[PDB]
Scaffold this active site. Structure first.
Site, PDB file in Angstrom:
ATOM      1  N   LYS A  49       0.834  -1.185   0.000  1.00 19.37           N
ATOM      2  CA  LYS A  49       0.000   0.000   0.000  1.00 19.37           C
ATOM      3  C   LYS A  49       0.875   1.244   0.000  1.00 19.37           C
ATOM      4  CE  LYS A  49      -2.099  -1.725   3.639  1.00 19.37           C
ATOM      5  NZ  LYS A  49      -1.540  -0.722   4.524  1.00 19.37           N
ATOM      6  N   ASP A  68       5.584  -8.616  10.782  1.00 21.99           N
ATOM      7  CA  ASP A  68       4.983  -8.932   9.514  1.00 21.99           C
ATOM      8  C   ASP A  68       5.604 -10.178   8.892  1.00 21.99           C
ATOM      9  OD1 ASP A  68       2.969  -8.524   7.633  1.00 21.99           O
ATOM     10  OD2 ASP A  68       4.121  -7.096   6.386  1.00 21.99           O
TER      11      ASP A  68
HETATM   12  N1  LIG Z   1      15.487  -7.757  -1.474  1.00 22.26           N
HETATM   13  C1  LIG Z   1      14.559  -8.266  -2.296  1.00 22.26           C
HETATM   14  N2  LIG Z   1      14.886  -9.196  -3.203  1.00 22.26           N
HETATM   15  C2  LIG Z   1      13.986  -9.719  -4.037  1.00 22.26           C
HETATM   16  N3  LIG Z   1      12.721  -9.321  -4.032  1.00 22.26           N
HETATM   17  C3  LIG Z   1      12.235  -8.425  -3.153  1.00 22.26           C
HETATM   18  C4  LIG Z   1      13.170  -7.838  -2.197  1.00 22.26           C
HETATM   19  N4  LIG Z   1      12.507  -6.938  -1.476  1.00 22.26           N
HETATM   20  C5  LIG Z   1      11.241  -6.949  -1.885  1.00 22.26           C
HETATM   21  N5  LIG Z   1      11.074  -7.824  -2.884  1.00 22.26           N
HETATM   22  C6  LIG Z   1       9.738  -8.083  -3.502  1.00 22.26           C
HETATM   23  O1  LIG Z   1       8.932  -6.922  -3.384  1.00 22.26           O
HETATM   24  C7  LIG Z   1       7.764  -7.302  -2.628  1.00 22.26           C
HETATM   25  C8  LIG Z   1       7.295  -6.171  -1.757  1.00 22.26           C
HETATM   26  O2  LIG Z   1       8.423  -5.719  -1.014  1.00 22.26           O
HETATM   27  P1  LIG Z   1       8.251  -5.156   0.488  1.00 22.26           P
HETATM   28  O3  LIG Z   1       9.466  -4.646   1.142  1.00 22.26           O
HETATM   29  O4  LIG Z   1       7.666  -6.284   1.204  1.00 22.26           O
HETATM   30  O5  LIG Z   1       7.132  -3.991   0.239  1.00 22.26           O
HETATM   31  P2  LIG Z   1       5.988  -3.507   1.281  1.00 22.26           P
HETATM   32  O6  LIG Z   1       5.461  -2.228   0.633  1.00 22.26           O
HETATM   33  O7  LIG Z   1       6.595  -3.316   2.627  1.00 22.26           O
HETATM   34  N6  LIG Z   1       4.808  -4.700   1.169  1.00 22.26           N
HETATM   35  P3  LIG Z   1       3.740  -5.178   2.454  1.00 22.26           P
HETATM   36  O8  LIG Z   1       4.131  -6.576   2.715  1.00 22.26           O
HETATM   37  O9  LIG Z   1       2.350  -5.175   1.864  1.00 22.26           O
HETATM   38  O10 LIG Z   1       4.045  -4.356   3.646  1.00 22.26           O
HETATM   39  C9  LIG Z   1       8.159  -8.485  -1.763  1.00 22.26           C
HETATM   40  O11 LIG Z   1       7.033  -9.246  -1.305  1.00 22.26           O
HETATM   41  C10 LIG Z   1       9.102  -9.200  -2.710  1.00 22.26           C
HETATM   42  O12 LIG Z   1       8.365 -10.042  -3.572  1.00 22.26           O
HETATM   43 MG   LIG Z   2       5.904  -4.017   4.577  1.00 17.53          MG
HETATM   44 MG   LIG Z   3       6.100  -7.171   2.313  1.00 13.00          MG
END
Ligand SMILES: Nc1ncnc2c1ncn2[C@@H]1O[C@H](COP(=O)(O)OP(=O)(O)NP(=O)(O)O)[C@@H](O)[C@H]1O
Ligand SMILES: [Mg+2]
Ligand SMILES: [Mg+2]
Length: 327
Positions: A43, A150
């Site tokens: 989000k 999380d």
């Molecule tokens: N270091 C990484 N290497 C490979 N893929 C990644 C990495 N970081 C994030 N991703 C991908 O990007 C997606 C979302 O990244 P993330 O840091 O979890 O975003 P967020 O906005 O915090 N999502 P939420 O889980 O809804 O809080 C992850 O679920 C992975 O599929």
């Molecule tokens: Mg997150």
């Molecule tokens: Mg995430």
């Protein structure tokens, strides 16, 4: 209620370790990193695979959407405190757009395989190995006074070929302080511990152990997710139908919590169901008394009753993984 382990970490450390609001970001160069393709989102972010122009190495660029700066500093500070810990994703750089001042977190790239396809392919040993590695990350962060809040498959990157695991997404993580009341609006619904579902706000590191338990049950029972509620109320009901309402009542009385009358009504009364009643043909090669014993010690209403990450890594279930590691 206080944590049974690592209660004093932030007490004993300098205020600057945990005062993320005071953090001063030293910005890197936005040009050093360029976007190759979108790979995820939340989000409040869009996440892309990228390349470090200086060395041509892959990287991950997490572009953050407008949120209270305090929320951004918190993710950054936690990543900084944990950088280098076992199986913790590394934050390599922080940059921003000069016109919008749009901030991007730059991470190490993990060649992840979608969990929805990866997990059905894991062997019994793979499950044990990856949960063990994940446990290392959690004991580490707990030991550094941080709760992830999380834990779910989407936040666990696995490079299956490199048998490398990284616990990512520290955007909901918080510093543990004895007696603090936390926001219960954390974790994905399917991974929320009872404490969150019943407004027990003085929770701790043990919340991550419920979430890990949920992930583990999904893997060994091959049911993603394992507790599939439509909303928060329905989530407590899904839990109660497996764990039973007896233990719940014990739990609520122990901690002096009144369940919302309408909620109390939805939950009703349920017998505790034994873990084998989820046993079937697809999952069979995966459950064993040790898997069940371990799961049972994670999925407890009472967060104080749950294994700690440390204890979990010593459970007999992982002896083969420990043995391989020890060489
Ligand atoms: N270091 C990484 N290497 C490979 N893929 C990644 C990495 N970081 C994030 N991703 C991908 O990007 C997606 C979302 O990244 P993330 O840091 O979890 O975003 P967020 O906005 O915090 N999502 P939420 O889980 O809804 O809080 C992850 O679920 C992975 O599929
Ligand atoms: Mg997150
Ligand atoms: Mg995430």
């Amino acid at each position: 209620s206080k944590a049974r382990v690592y209660a004093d970490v932030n007490v004993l450390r300098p205020k600057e370790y945990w005062d993320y609001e005071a953090l001063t970001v030293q910005w890197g160069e936005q040009d050093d990193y360029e976007v190759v393709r979108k790979v995820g989102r939340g989000k409040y972010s869009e996440v892309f695979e990228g390349i470090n122009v200086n060395n041509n190495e892959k990287c991950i660029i997490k572009i953050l959407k407008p949120v209270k700066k305090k929320k951004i500093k918190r993710e950054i500070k936690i990543l900084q405190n944990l950088c280098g810990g076992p199986n913790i994703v590394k934050l390599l750089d922080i940059v921003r757009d000069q016109h919008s001042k749009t901030p991007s977190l730059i991470f190490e790239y993990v060649n992840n395989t979608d969990f929805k396809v990866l997990y059905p392919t894991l062997t019994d040993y793979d499950i044990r190995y990856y949960i063990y590695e994940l446990l290392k990350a959690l004991d580490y962060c707990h030991s550094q006074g941080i709760m992830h809040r999380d834990v779910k498959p989407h936040n666990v990157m696995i490079d299956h070929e490199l048998r490398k695991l990284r616990l990512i997404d520290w955007g909901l993580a918080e510093f543990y302080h004895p007696g603090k009341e936390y926001n219960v609006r954390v974790a994905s619904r399917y991974f929320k511990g009872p404490e969150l579902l019943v407004d027990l706000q003085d929770y701790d590191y043990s919340l991550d152990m419920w979430s890990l338990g949920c992930m583990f049950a999904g893997m060994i029972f091959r049911k993603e997710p394992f507790f599939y509620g439509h909303d928060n109320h329905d989530q407590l009901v899904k839990i109660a139908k497996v764990l039973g309402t007896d233990g719940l009542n014990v739990y609520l009385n122990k901690y002096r919590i009144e369940l919302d009358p309408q909620l109390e009504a939805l939950v009703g009364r349920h017998s505790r169901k034994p873990w084998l009643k989820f046993m079937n043909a697809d999952n069979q090669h995966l459950v064993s008394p040790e898997a069940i014993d371990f799961l049972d010690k994670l999925l407890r209403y009472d967060h104080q009753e749950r294994l700690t990450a440390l204890e979990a890594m010593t459970h007999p279930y992982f002896q083969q993984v420990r043995a391989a590691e020890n060489s």
